[PDB]
């Protein structure tokens, strides 16, 4: 992963226009519907039991947003990631009890929420560069677990 100066202009260019909303909460809602054993770190919230309403859900939509916003600091600092993420890697271990498998799981889903938002604008060419990014993030986040 010593990505084209380029695939950045792109992995960046596509990113610009994640109207950071609809999008984060859909990654969010799509994850607790599909891989339902992640509803575990999240009865912190409400009604996650019929998907009309995980989606229908505000605390998710809010959580949703915050996860995506903090992913974006990643996209814009894709050089020395491990650094950007270091504190939340440090926080997601000793505070949060998150199956770091659940990170790789949320990128796979994201790269699918993304795939769906773009359609024909989300390629081959581009999916390879985001599958390059997502795993990058997951492994900077996947860090200081001891």
């Amino acid at each position: 992963v010593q990505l084209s100066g380029e695939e950045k202009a792109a992995v960046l260019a596509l990113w610009d226009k994640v109207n950071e909303e609809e999008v984060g909460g859909e990654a969010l809602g799509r994850l607790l519907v599909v891989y339902p054993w992640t509803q575990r770190f999240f009865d912190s919230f409400g009604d996650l039991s019929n998907p009309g309403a995980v989606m229908g859900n505000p605390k998710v939509k809010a959580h949703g947003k915050k996860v995506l916003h903090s992913f974006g600091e990643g996209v814009h600092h894709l050089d020395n990631l491990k650094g950007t993420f270091a504190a939340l890697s440090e926080l997601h271990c000793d505070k949060l009890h998150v199956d770091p498998e659940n990170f790789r799981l949320l990128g796979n889903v994201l790269a699918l929420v993304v795939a769906r938002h773009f359609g024909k604008d989300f390629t081959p060419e581009l999916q390879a560069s985001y599958q390059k990014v997502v795993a990058g993030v997951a492994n900077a986040l996947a860090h200081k677990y001891h």
């Binding site: 809602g29 799509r30 519907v33 599909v34 998907p51 989606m55 796979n108 790269a111 699918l112 795939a115 769906r116 773009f118 359609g119 024909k120 989300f122 081959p124 060419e125 999916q127 390879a128 599958q131």
Partner: protein
């Protein structure tokens, strides 16, 4: 395993795809080729590029593969006896890449089907693609 609702959610989705099964299946083949470098290894004979009628020819016998998997969904083991005695004896394609292809079919998918790829559906489509996965994978050890 697959609820009525699973067998269902799956049918809407596999009948939107229609006569585009191997149009999609070939562009799912491609992105795996694309996204994972790693898998192109069970393919050193194939012309991998945007061109590859070795990939579309290939990418047809796959979706041909999943079209008839929706249909014989009660008895998946029986429908796939051969096409998994094939994956096991011969091809011996490691049970790991199956998850990478299912995610390359899944995404695929999303793109040609945005409206109808709801999420009660991305969840039944993921169950089907894993079961298919598990069947193909079985005749190993």
């Amino acid at each position: 395993v697959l609820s009525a609702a699973d067998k269902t959610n799956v049918k809407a989705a596999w009948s939107k795809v229609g006569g585009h099964a191997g149009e999609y299946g070939a562009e799912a083949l491609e992105r795996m080729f694309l996204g994972f470098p790693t898998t192109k290894t069970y393919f050193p004979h194939f012309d991998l590029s945007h061109g590859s009628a070795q990939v579309k020819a290939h990418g047809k016998k796959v979706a041909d593969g999943l079209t008839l998997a929706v249909g014989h969904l009660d008895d998946l083991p029986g429908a796939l006896s051969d096409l998994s005695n094939l994956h096991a004896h011969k091809l011996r394609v490691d049970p790991v890449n199956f998850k990478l292809l299912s995610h390359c079919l899944l995404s695929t998918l999303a793109v040609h089907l945005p409206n109808d790829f709801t999420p009660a559906v991305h969840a039944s489509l993921d169950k089907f693609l894993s079961s298919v996965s598990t069947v193909l994978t079985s005749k190993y050890r």
